[PDB]
Structure formats: C-alpha cells, structure tokens
Amino acid sequence: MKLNISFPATGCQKLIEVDDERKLRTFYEKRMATEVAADALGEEWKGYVVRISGGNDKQG
Amino acid sequence: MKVELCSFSGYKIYPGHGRRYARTDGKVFQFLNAKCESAFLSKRNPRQINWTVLYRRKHKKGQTRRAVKFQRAITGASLADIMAKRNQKPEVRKAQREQAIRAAKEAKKAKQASKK
Amino acid sequence: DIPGLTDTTVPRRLGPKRASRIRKLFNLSKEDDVRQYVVRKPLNKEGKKPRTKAPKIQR
Amino acid sequence: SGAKFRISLGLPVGAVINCADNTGAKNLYIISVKGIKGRLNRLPAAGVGDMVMATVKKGKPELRKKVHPAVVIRQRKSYRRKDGVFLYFEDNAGVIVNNKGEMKGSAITGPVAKECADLWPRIASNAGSIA
RNA sequence: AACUGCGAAUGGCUCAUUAAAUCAGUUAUGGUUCCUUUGGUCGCUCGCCACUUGGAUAACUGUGGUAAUUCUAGA
RNA sequence: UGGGUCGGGGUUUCGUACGUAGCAGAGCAGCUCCCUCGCUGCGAUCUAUUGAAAGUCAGCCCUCGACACAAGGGUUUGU
RNA sequence: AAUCCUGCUCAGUACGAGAGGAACCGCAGGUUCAGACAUUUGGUGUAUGUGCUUGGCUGAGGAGCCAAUGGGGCGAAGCU
Numbered sequence: 001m002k003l004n005i006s007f008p009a010t011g012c013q014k015l016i017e018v019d020d021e022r023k024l025r026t027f028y029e030k031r032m033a034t035e036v037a038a039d040a041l042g043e044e045w046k047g048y049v050v051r052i053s054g055g056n057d058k059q060g
Numbered sequence: 061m062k063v064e065l066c067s068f069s070g071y072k073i074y075p076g077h078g079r080r081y082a083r084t085d086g087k088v089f090q091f092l093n094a095k096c097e098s099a100f101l102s103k104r105n106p107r108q109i110n111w112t113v114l115y116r117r118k119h120k121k122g123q124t125r126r127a128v129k130f131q132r133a134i135t136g137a138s139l140a141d142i143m144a145k146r147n148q149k150p151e152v153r154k155a156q157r158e159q160a161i162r163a164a165k166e167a168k169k170a171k172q173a174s175k176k
Numbered sequence: 177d178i179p180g181l182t183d184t185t186v187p188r189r190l191g192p193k194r195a196s197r198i199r200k201l202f203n204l205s206k207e208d209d210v211r212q213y214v215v216r217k218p219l220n221k222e223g224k225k226p227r228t229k230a231p232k233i234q235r
Numbered sequence: 236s237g238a239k240f241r242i243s244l245g246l247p248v249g250a251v252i253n254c255a256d257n258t259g260a261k262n263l264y265i266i267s268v269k270g271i272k273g274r275l276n277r278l279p280a281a282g283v284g285d286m287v288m289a290t291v292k293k294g295k296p297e298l299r300k301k302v303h304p305a306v307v308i309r310q311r312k313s314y315r316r317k318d319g320v321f322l323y324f325e326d327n328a329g330v331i332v333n334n335k336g337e338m339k340g341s342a343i344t345g346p347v348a349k350e351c352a353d354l355w356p357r358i359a360s361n362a363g364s365i366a
Numbered sequence: 367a368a369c370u371g372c373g374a375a376u377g378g379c380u381c382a383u384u385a386a387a388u389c390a391g392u393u394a395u396g397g398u399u400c401c402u403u404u405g406g407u408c409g410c411u412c413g414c415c416a417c418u419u420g421g422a423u424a425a426c427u428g429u430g431g432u433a434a435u436u437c438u439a440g441a
Numbered sequence: 442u443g444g445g446u447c448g449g450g451g452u453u454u455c456g457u458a459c460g461u462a463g464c465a466g467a468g469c470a471g472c473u474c475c476c477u478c479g480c481u482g483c484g485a486u487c488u489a490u491u492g493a494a495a496g497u498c499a500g501c502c503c504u505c506g507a508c509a510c511a512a513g514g515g516u517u518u519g520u
Numbered sequence: 521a522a523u524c525c526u527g528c529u530c531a532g533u534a535c536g537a538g539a540g541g542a543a544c545c546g547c548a549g550g551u552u553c554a555g556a557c558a559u560u561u562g563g564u565g566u567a568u569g570u571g572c573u574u575g576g577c578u579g580a581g582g583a584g585c586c587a588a589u590g591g592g593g594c595g596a597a598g599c600u
C-alpha cells in the first residue's frame with residue numbers, strides 16, 4: 001500500500017511505499033479530513049500529525 | 061481466525077455460528093441465529109428493533125476554528141525579496157509614491173506641450 | 177526535517193494578478209507605484225537571449 | 236484432485252425445481268439421481284452439484300415429454316461447507332446438461348453453488364455469480 | 367491549453383405507431399410563452415473602496431491509483 | 442468442616458417494564474379583563490428515564506454473604 | 521461387522537493398423553451398514569420463559585386470570 005504525503009508549507013509531495021500493517025493501522029478505521037499522528041513509522045515521523053485528504057481503491 | 065462476518069443485527073459472527081443466505085438476485089446474507097434470520101425473512105427493519113446495532117447508533121444509544129497562511133517564495137522573487145519590498149513600509153513606501161508623482165508631473169508638463 | 181520532503185521548498189509558480197491581491201501580499205496602501213511592485217517572472221532559455229516577463233494586472 | 240464432500244441432499248425424487256438456464260424450460264421434475272445405489276423404501280435424493288435425470292413439466296413442447304440429464308445448482312436445504320458455514324439458497328434450481336457435462340443452454344440466471352462449480356467447469360463458466 | 371459565452375432542440379434518416387387522431391383549408395389566443403433581430407428604456411427611486419470591493423477555480427508545476435474509459439484524487 | 446436453603450454475581454431468553462416527564466402526537470372539546478399567540482382537558486401511538494423489566498436449575502456456572510441443620514435413626518452379618 | 525463404488529495418478533501408457541484402451545502401488549472422497557454424540561445447523565418446546573393479541577371477568581390504572589395448551593412470534597435446558 002502506497003501513501004501520498006504532501007506538505008503544503010513546502011510543497012514537495014512524495015510517495016511512501018509500505019508493506020507493514022501496523023504503521024498503516026493507525027490510519028485504519030478513520031474518515032477523511034481527520035488529523036492523525038504518524039508516530040507509527042520509524043523514529044523520523046515523530047511530532048507529526050497528518051490529515052487524511054483522500055485515497056484510491058484497489059480498483060482505482 | 062477466518063473472515064469475521066456481521067449479521068442482520070450488526071453483531072459479529074464467529075466461525076461455526078449461524079447460517080448464510082444466498083438469494084436468487086445474487087446478494088448474500090449471514091445471520092447470527094434463527095432470531096435474526098427470521099426477523100430478516102419477515103422483512104422487519106433492524107432500525108426499528110431495539111437490540112440491533114443499527115437501532116442503537118441511529119438513536120445514538122450509549123454513544124473549533126482554525127486557519128493558517130504561510131509566506132512562500134514566488135517564481136521571480138524569493139521570500140527575502142517580498143519581505144524587503146513589504147518592509148519598505150517605514151516611509152520608504154511613501155518615498156516611492158511621491159517620486160513617481162513628480163516623475164509623472166514633468167512628463168505631464170511635456171504632455172501639455174504634446175496634448176496642446 | 178524529513179529527507180527529500182521538508183526541504184528544497186518549491187515556490188508558487190506565479191504571483192498575484194489582481195490589483196488588490198498584490199496589495200495584500202505587499203502591504204500597498206494606495207498609488208504606491210502599484211505597477212512596478214508586481215512580480216516580474218524571468219525567462220531563461222538557452223536558444224534565446226535572457227528576458228523577464230510581466231503579467232497584465234486586472235482591476 | 237479432490238472429490239466433493241458429503242452435503243445435505245434435500246431434493247428427493249419427485250421434487251420440481253426451477254430451470255435456471257435459457258433452454259426454454261421453466262421447471263425440472265427429478266425422476267432419479269445418478270450414482271444412487273439406494274436402499275429399501277429410501278427415496279434417491281440429490282444436492283447441489285448432483286447429476287439428476289429430469290423431465291420438464293412446463294416449458295417448451297419440444298423439451299417436455301423427454302428425460303433430460305440435469306445438474307442441481309441451487310438448493311434450499313441448508314448444508315455445511317467444511318468450514319462451519321451453513322449455506323442455503325432462496326430456491327432449488329438446476330440446469331439441463333448432457334451426459335458429458337455440457338450445459339444445453341448458454342446462460343444461468345442467479346448464483347451457482349461453489350460445489351456445483353468446481354465439479355462442473357462448463358456450468359461454472361456460464362455462472363454469473365458463485366455462492 | 368483552459369475558463370467564459372454561444373451552438374449542439376437546426377439539418378439528415380425512416381414511416382413503426384396513429385382513423386376527427388395526424389393533416390388540409392378557415393379562424394381565435396379579449397385564454398399564453400418566446401433565445402435571437404429591430405425599435406423603445408437604462409441620473410424618472412430623495413436612500414473610512416467608488417480613482418474599482420471579496421473568495422475560489424481552471425489552464426499550469428508536482429505526487430499517483432486503476433487491466434481498462436473522453437475516469438480521476440490529493441498538493 | 443460438610444451439604445442444604447435463601448441472597449449475590451456470571452450466563453442466557455425475550456425485547457425496552459410500572460410510574461413520571463415532554464412546546465412529540467392525527468386531531469377534537471372548553472376559557473379568552475386573561476392571552477397578542479396562549480392555557481386546561483381527551484387522545485391510540487412516540488421519545489427519555491431504559492439493551493430496560495421479567496425469568497434463569499428445578500439435571501446451568503461461581504459463591505463463602507445470611508439462616509438453620511448436621512457423631513442421628515432402624516435391621517442384620519463370625520473363619 | 522463392516523461393505524461397495526467413484527474421481528485423480530499410473531496413462532492417451534501397456535495392447536492395437538486404427539478405432540479405442542486397462543492394471544499394481546499411492547492419494548482424495550463417497551454408498552450401504554454399524555456404534556455413538558449435540559460444539560455447530562435443524563426439529564420439538566407447557567422452563568407455561570418473555571413480548572404481541574381476540575372474547576370475557578376482577579369498578580378503572582397497574583397486576584392478572586378463564587377460553588379442556590385461547591391464538592400467535594421468539595425461546596434456555598433436555599431430547600433428537
């Protein structure tokens with residue numbers, strides 16, 4: 001599952017590829033336009049709360 | 061540890077429990093027990109049956125302002141350039157407005173000779 | 177900073193155009209040489225001379 | 236390979252089931268079940284995926300007064316599927332086939348039981364959905 | 367390129383339906399609607415921006431999803 | 442120490458109790474110095490209290506709470 | 521006191537001009553029978569358990585009862 005990350009203040013959006021469910025499951029069972037903290041991924045995504053803005057289905 | 065299903069009542073159907081109902085029109089349903097199944101077959105709406113999950117969230121049984129704008133570089137001017145331009149406020153701006161008027165006033169005097 | 181994300185900030189492609197959207201961005205009061213304060217985008221192509229391009233400001 | 240597990244039958248001889256194909260037949264009257272040795276007084280019964288001999292009672296005249304091989308694709312008796320699920324359908328339905336296993340018709344209305352699918356690939360290809 | 371405005375309700379094809387229906391001649395709308403065209407009307411009203419107000423969105427840059435579509439999302 | 446009997450908890454069945462409250466309610470009937478849009482009744486049903494109420498070993502599970510009772514009775518048996 | 525059959529593989533193989541076309545080992549299942557069992561699904565259901573409901577009755581409410589199980593929905597346990 002891929003993650004599209006965009007930071008409006010600096011632009012420079014980039015794509016993250018993850019195959020681990022636990023980093024993703026913090027996002028799971030959440031609706032759009034809800035802000036969630038991405039402290040799940042490693043030690044580099046810390047102090048970062050992120051807003052779900054959209055996505056795509058397996059079929060696109 | 062199989063797929064976890066949900067019933068007519070919204071309850072969670074563990075493996076080896078209930079029945080699954082496949083209609084002719086292609087839709088498939090699973091019921092936790094004969095009570096939920098008989099209610100579904102008699103076309104009773106689960107939103108009107110009290111002990112149903114759909115009823116409970118329908119009646120909700122048991123369960124600010126923000127904005128920010130950030131200065132950015134714009135192609136042709138770095139964030140430094142815009143800040144310096146907008147920091148011409150302490151009469152430097154007024155200094156630039158007034159020299160333009162006199163820089164157009166003598167042109168107007170030349171324009172008076174060009175108009176007339 | 178996230179590597180490759182929170183760095184090398186991309187500029188807004190092109191500045192304001194309306195004669196009021198430039199005043200809000202640059203704190204123009206009134207008739208303070210409004211035309212010149214508009215952002216002038218420079219164009220630099222190898223098979224041509226350098227030149228800067230200004231946009232038409234509306235209202 | 237893998238053979239079909241035992242399932243609850245629920246369609247004895249004399250059962251009139253719907254015909255789910257476009258052959259023009261509307262119903263199918265089961266007269267016997269293939270592979271049934273039987274027993275005194277016991278009716279030969281069939282479940283989904285079973286090959287039966289049937290005569291269409293109402294339908295088109297050129298199909299009526301004959302014996303047709305048919306395969307049960309849907310059954311209304313609940314049956315267990317080795318993984319704990321008891322599945323049953325809204326009606327008893329079957330399709331007309333030949334002794335070789337090829338469906339006389341071309342399309343199937345409604346779902347087809349999974350047991351009938353992997354046992355009869357010709358029926359499976361024509362199945363709109365699989366239950 | 368795109369936003370906007372306009373057109374796409376004309377034309378072309380066929381004759382299945384349809385027997386006071388369609389259609390033809392005649393007459394009415396003092397019982398209605400009408401883009402456009404043309405001509406009227408546009409200081410007729412007493413009542414801290416007007417030297418010009420507000421926000422977004424295209425096109426555009428950038429990250430993709432989908433087997434596929436004149437499909438589209440986020441920034 | 443024991444097993445009982447109640448009680449309690451658990452499980453489970455059904456499906457949301459009585460009462461009270463509501464500017465909920467098809468409407469209808471009375472009071473208008475009153476009200477300046479109201480009040481007083483009738484009214485199936487609805488909502489909240491309330492996954493409430495009720496039952497649950499009699500052949501369900503655990504109690505260590507309460508109560509009393511439990512070294513008692515009768516008939517026989519010897520190489 | 522167990523019984524028989526089918527499918528896969530062997531194998532389009534042996535055999536045969538060809539058409540056709542096996543078997544042994546192995547694997548997966550079924551039929552008839554037998555002995556149980558109730559976790560699951562189904563049946564029963566007067567736990568007369570809990571709602572609904574007709575007629576009547578207790579002055580009404582509440583709570584109930586009678587109609588040889590009033591009727592009906594759902595139903596524990598047990599049996600199956």
Ligand SMILES: [K+]
Pocket residue numbers: 271272273
């Ligand atoms: K037989």
Ligand SMILES: [K+]
Pocket residue numbers: none
């Ligand atoms: K109540």
Ligand SMILES: [K+]
Pocket residue numbers: 457491493
């Ligand atoms: K309630």
Ligand SMILES: [K+]
Pocket residue numbers: none
């Ligand atoms: K009952």
Ligand SMILES: [K+]
Pocket residue numbers: none
């Ligand atoms: K039952």
Ligand SMILES: [K+]
Pocket residue numbers: none
């Ligand atoms: K039972």
Ligand SMILES: [Mg+2]
Pocket residue numbers: 234235
């Ligand atoms: Mg203009």
Ligand SMILES: [Mg+2]
Pocket residue numbers: 275276
């Ligand atoms: Mg006989």
Ligand SMILES: [Mg+2]
Pocket residue numbers: none
């Ligand atoms: Mg108890």
Ligand SMILES: [Mg+2]
Pocket residue numbers: none
């Ligand atoms: Mg014998």
Ligand SMILES: [Mg+2]
Pocket residue numbers: none
């Ligand atoms: Mg009564």
Ligand SMILES: [Mg+2]
Pocket residue numbers: none
């Ligand atoms: Mg009463």
Ligand SMILES: [Mg+2]
Pocket residue numbers: 586
């Ligand atoms: Mg009496």
Ligand SMILES: [Mg+2]
Pocket residue numbers: none
């Ligand atoms: Mg009597």
Ligand SMILES: [Mg+2]
Pocket residue numbers: none
């Ligand atoms: Mg029942």
